[model samples]
Structures are given as structure tokens and as C-alpha cells.
Target: ENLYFQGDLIVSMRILGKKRTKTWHKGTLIAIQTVGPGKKYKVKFDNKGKSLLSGNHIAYDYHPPADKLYVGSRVVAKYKDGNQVWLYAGIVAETPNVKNKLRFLIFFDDGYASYVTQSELYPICRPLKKTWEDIEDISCRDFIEEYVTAYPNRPMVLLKSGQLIKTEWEGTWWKSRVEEVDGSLVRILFLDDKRCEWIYRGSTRLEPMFS
Candidate 1:
């Protein structure tokens, strides 16, 4: 059954799992996967807003990402004071993180499912339940951020470009999209379900933060 998140999306991600390692260092991060072996990697980002390409310090693993994880188990992480950190559950729409504490479903989206997740726009606080209604009654644009469902072999969602995310089973389309709003690449659709792939493109280079 599709899970229901009834709170801020980011904050809700906090309690998604427990502590994994004994190194309770602040600013630690568990790198979730988007594709390939699809595992969660434990590392620390340059908390000072420095770019990864710069000489600033960053951590990563050389191991193959895990294939599966528990729904709410501890992988590896840390917390810093005054840092805006919130717990969130990642859904794999395309790519998979090998080191996630919890890996359940594969979320899928083609962008047209419009929704944006800012620091203040998380904890969706709702679930997409199966409904036999037509496109007009249940919105297709917001399906990515919702616990929505589609009929057996029927068009479930219609995109802004007229594409369709037709539903196949009683599953949740949990996904997200992060990007540099005005960068040179000017790319949109970073994540399909926060743990998926870039809908506009097939890359995992997501914007660390959005403005």
C-alpha cells in the first residue's frame, strides 16, 4: 500500500529512520541514490555553501550502492546546530540509491506532474489513494507530490506538454525535482520522487539548494 505523509515533506523525512553509525558528527549526510546500484552513501557536504568542484571538503564512498533498504532504518547521518535539516523519505522513480536506509517503491514522473519542494513546502501531509475518477476530478499535475493512483491500463496523469503518466498498479508516485532555478544549464525536473531521476534529463546532478 502507498504510504501517507501527513506533515511537512522535509521534516517528515527526519523521523524516517534511526541513527545508523556511532559517529554522531554534526553536518553528516546520507547520500541517497537516484539510479544504478541505487544505494545510500554516507558522506558530508561542504556545509559552508562551497561548490563541490571547488577545493572545499566533501566525502564519498567507493563502494557499489546498495540495492535495497528498510522502510525506516538507520543508514548513516549527523546533525548540525542551526542547520536547516529535516527528515524525508526518498522514492525511486528512475535511479536508485544503493545506501538508503529504506527503499521500498520506485516512483516515476515525466515532469508535467507539476510541484516544487522548497524548505518550507515539505511534509506533504497527504497520501494519494486510488480513485476511479477522471482527469478533471483528481488533478494530474500535482500527482507527483500526492499519494495518487491510476486505473488499470488507463491514463492517470496528463503533463503540461500533453504526456501521460498512466498508472498500472496501486502504487505511490512519490517524487521530487530540485534545480538551479536560473543556472546556465537552466534545467528543471531534478528528481521524480526525491529519490528518482531527472525527468527533463537523465542525470543525478541535482542543485544542492534552490532559491
Candidate 2:
């Protein structure tokens, strides 16, 4: 039985097999794979990397109501850091409606965009004294800061046009090569799938080659 859908905010009610330590940990459902007895889901927590968890072990968060979302909207959600998770501020960068569901490109306060759904978002009920516009300017710089921190010891390079490459993620960087560089737009090719994509320089940070 499917108790949760992509984008829903879930709390760890009780993890299977392991002793539940962080009972307050929250996460957003990213993907649901397989079915029947072995059904599993991909959940991204605020303080931890993506995890595959069972639905029964998680419960929906009902405090802040989930509301209709749009681009530029601000939300309160969980952010992952190492093995710890915490509630943090986030903004919707893009909202692509697929079929009847909404898929969101959410940029956390720490920077970096990830796909989520409406069910995972909560309204800022009272107001944080500041809105997303108040901090959107820092997003670009934060992305660069995260990239430099993760690969500080990696070599550096100016990405040229038409080179396949990797970019950014929550913790580490995407391992691909640059396919091309044009003005502020950087085209990338994922080394694994060989997919080509056009991205903005402020949107994704390019890494240097080791060799």
C-alpha cells in the first residue's frame, strides 16, 4: 500500500530493524520504486544523504499545512547535513506540472536545487520577517561556496565548449565533464548517461580535472 507520494513531508515514526535515535528527523519523498511487499521510496532528509525507506516507518507532518506552491514561493522544510537533519528555509525555483502532479525545483537556503513535490512543502504560517526575495541574491554565491568546500583539494580548470562533465549535488559534486561554455550558459554532458544539458554558470559550479 502506498501511504505517501512524491513530495510529501514525512517524519521517521520508527525505522525498521534499527533503533530510532533521531525521532524528529524529517524528509521529503523524492521517488517511489517497485511495488508489492518490497516497495521502496527515495527520501532526501535535511541532515542526511538520500535514503531508501519503507512507508510504514514514516509518517506525514501535519503541523504546517501543505499548500498550493509556485515559483518564487518560500517554504519551511528539512535540510540534510551529514547524518543530521533540521528544519530550514527553502524557495521554489521552478514548478513543472507533470500530468496531474506538481514537480518542484527547490533551492534550499544553503544552495543547490532538488526536485520535490507539493506534498513536501509547508507554508510559513506567521512570517519569518523576511521572504525568499530577501535572500535569493545569496543563492548563486552559496552554490559556489558549497562547490569549493567539497572539492577544495581538486584541480581547477576553465570549462571549454563541448566537453562532457559533472556539476553539483547536495554533499559532493556531480562527476561529469563540460561539453561547452557560452556566455553565462554552460552545457554539460553526464559521463554516466552521456546526456547533454544547458545550464547557467550561476546555477551550477564547474569542477577542475585531476589529471
Candidate 3:
């Protein structure tokens, strides 16, 4: 099966013995071809290097945004530098120059910088509190800068009122609007289906970075 499509930002996990010694490299998944039982993926890296890799040799980057990314937001980014690819707490040092660009430089906690794509970012938790009354008068439907799946040990997170997000209903994800937060639960009104109910924090996730 083709796990990644064309233009998908993928990482090469192959440990090469030559100039491609970097264990991980951010690349774009290009064409896919099938010769026998397995599918081969052609990846073009940011360095202009190319590779034909198997599925196990490639993986999708894990950058999920917390609302719209800004210069000062804290994030957990997949920082790939030197010969290592590791997750680190970093800040968005700079955003894309133009509206259509996707690459941005992240200043990691260790004073290292890497230009990563949006898919290489994930939301980091913060001590934020919002009530339904605070945003009831808001005209546009927007989302907050927190994701329930960001940090599991985070205890609890508060979502703002009238915020649009994708949350789990039953065992599947669905579009929902935040109604309120009570105790360790969040009440959400579904966009489709019907009714409203309090859902657990673990059942909530950030909206897809791609609109």
C-alpha cells in the first residue's frame, strides 16, 4: 500500500554508509512505483538529494500546529541536525516569508536551528483557561492553541467557547464545537449527527493542519 502520497513531507530513516550518513532527512514523497510485492517511493530531500526507499525507510513528519503558528509560540518539533533526529522543545524563530511558503526556522532549546516544515511541529501544552462566556460574542468561528493529545500527562486543558475543533465521538473523530468545560470533561456540540455531551480530554485533538 502507498502510505504516503506525492508532495507529502516524509523523512528517510535509512542509515546509509556514505555521504547520506544522516539517519534522518526531511524529504518530499514524489512518485510511487510497484514492481513486485512492495511499493517503492521516490523522495526528494531539502538538500536536493534523492532516494528510492521502501515504506520502512520513510515516515511522515509529525508537526501538528497549535492554532495558527506565530513567531513566539512554544512547540515540540522534530529537530534533525548533525547525525541525529530528535524531538526537542523549541520556539518558532521565523515564519514563512510569503503566504505560500511552508518552511520555517526553529530555534531549539539547545541553541541549534533547523528549517522545518509545518508537519514537523506539534502543539505544546500551556496553562490556559477559557470560559464559554468569554467568546460568545465573537463573530468568527475559530479554534484555540491547545491540543488534548499534545501531552498525555498534562492533567487537563481548557478549550475556549465557540471554538471549532475535531473531537472523538464514540470511537471515531468528528467535527465539534466547544460548549464548555466542566471538571475534567469538555462539552461539545457536533456539527452533524445530533445533541451534545461531555467528552474526555483524551478524546480531543487539534484540527488537521491542512484545512
Candidate 4:
């Protein structure tokens, strides 16, 4: 309603009341629905997720910067509003056709994922700019120490639940305990099956629990 068009177009809108003050999010308008006397929209935000918002709380903007995007391209994604500072950096995870419109799924450095169109991205560099070896060298020590201090003898869950261990060929990350903590790696004992493994502490995503 009120001169706003839909389908395959990018727009920015102001966030509604009682949330964070003076915040705006930009995304592609997926669909518009009528709720009560107002219109709500289904918007897929860049580096953020989808949400339904009222028309009264929205405004339109024309033209975002053009992006040359592809799978595995490193780029800066538009995150939040105000001051127009785009900080989150990531690689394009995938590009899929949704209703004939191309959408980019970006996997960020901070271990979060979001979807955006080409208009919402700015190219940065190449994929894996730093070697895996470099990442291992810089991050392993601190990560091991941190995990050891926090979890101690407590059990932990892997980032991808039920993730398989390569060597054992039978063990999945159902319930594992950190058996030993080393400088560069951690020895994890699968509570269910596999005996133990030395996993890279820095690369592993874990949530610890005491039981």
C-alpha cells in the first residue's frame, strides 16, 4: 500500500517502536500481507533474518551499491543501521534461485549466517585469505586454554551435532568429553562410541555442560 512495490526489489525500512531506537534494516521485500488495518511485509534482511513489519514503520530508499558476487567471494555485508558503517565480513555460502530471484547466502567470520541480495554486498577479497595453517598457528593456543578453563571435566557438544569423526569411522559427536587439553589441540573422548581424538581446539565449536 501507499506506493510501495514488491517482488525482486531491494528496500530499506525503519524498525518499529519499543525495539532498539533509531535502527533500520535493509532487505528484499518478499511479500506483503494485510494485518488488521495496516500492511505487514515479509523482509529478508542482510546479515539478519526475515521478519514481518508494519507499513507505517517502513520507508523506501532507491538504489544500493552494485555487487559482483559469487560462491566463495569474500565481501563486507551490511549489518545494522546508523552511521552507515558496514563491518561484518564473510564469504558467499551459496546463491540460490528463490522465485526466480537470485539470493546470496553469506557465511560470516563470526560464525553466523544470513541471506542478502547482490545490492547488499560489497566485495572485499578472496576466500580463505589466510591459510588454514596460519589460522591454526594464531588461534589454537588461546582457544585450547579457554576451553580447558571453562569446561574442565564437563562434557561438551560439537558445533554440528552428530558430526562424524574421520579416523574412527564410527564415532559421531553425540556426547563427548574433553579428556586432555593441549596447547594446540584437545583430546576428546566420545562418551558413546569412539575412544578419543585430538581435535583442533580453535576450529571446533563447542558448548560445555556439567553432568
Q: What do the candidate models score in CA lDDT, each in turn? A: 0.24, 0.49, 0.50, 0.45
| Candidate 1 C-alpha error for residue 45, in Å | 26
lDDT, candidate 3, 1-211, per-residue tens: 4444333333343221101442455566665666766566677777668787654345445555434666555555675548766655455545665531546656444433456788777643230232111222221102222321232243345577788888654456788788876433467788897567655443334343222
The list of candidate 4 runs beyond 4 A from truth reads 1-68, 81-85, 99-101, 125-211
| Ordered list by TM-score, greatest first | 2, 4, 3, 1
Question: How does residue 202 of candidate 3 score in lDDT?
Answer: 34
TM-score of each: 0.19, 0.37, 0.29, 0.29
Q: lDDT value for candidate 3? A: 0.50
Model 4 agreement with the true structure over 1-211: per-residue lDDT tens digits: 5335443322344321111232345565566665455556666766567776644233343322334445555555666547765545555555545431456665454444456666666543112333121112334334433433443242433334344333222222356666655333356677677567554443444433211
Candidate 2 ranges beyond 4 A from true positions:
1-67, 80-83, 99-101, 126-130, 136-163, 166-211
User: RMSD of model 1, in Å?
Assistant: 18.3
The residue-by-residue lDDT of candidate 2 on 1-211, one tens digit each, is 5444334433332221101342335566665665654656566666666667544334344433234554445564554559865544556555555521545555665554555555555554222233343343465535434443443242335567655555754446666766666443456787766775555454535554422
Off by over 4 Å in 1: 1-65, 69-82, 96-211
Q: Residue 124 deviation, candidate 3, in Å?
A: 0.5
Candidate 4 to truth, TM: 0.29
Between prediction 2 and prediction 4, the one with superior lDDT is: 2
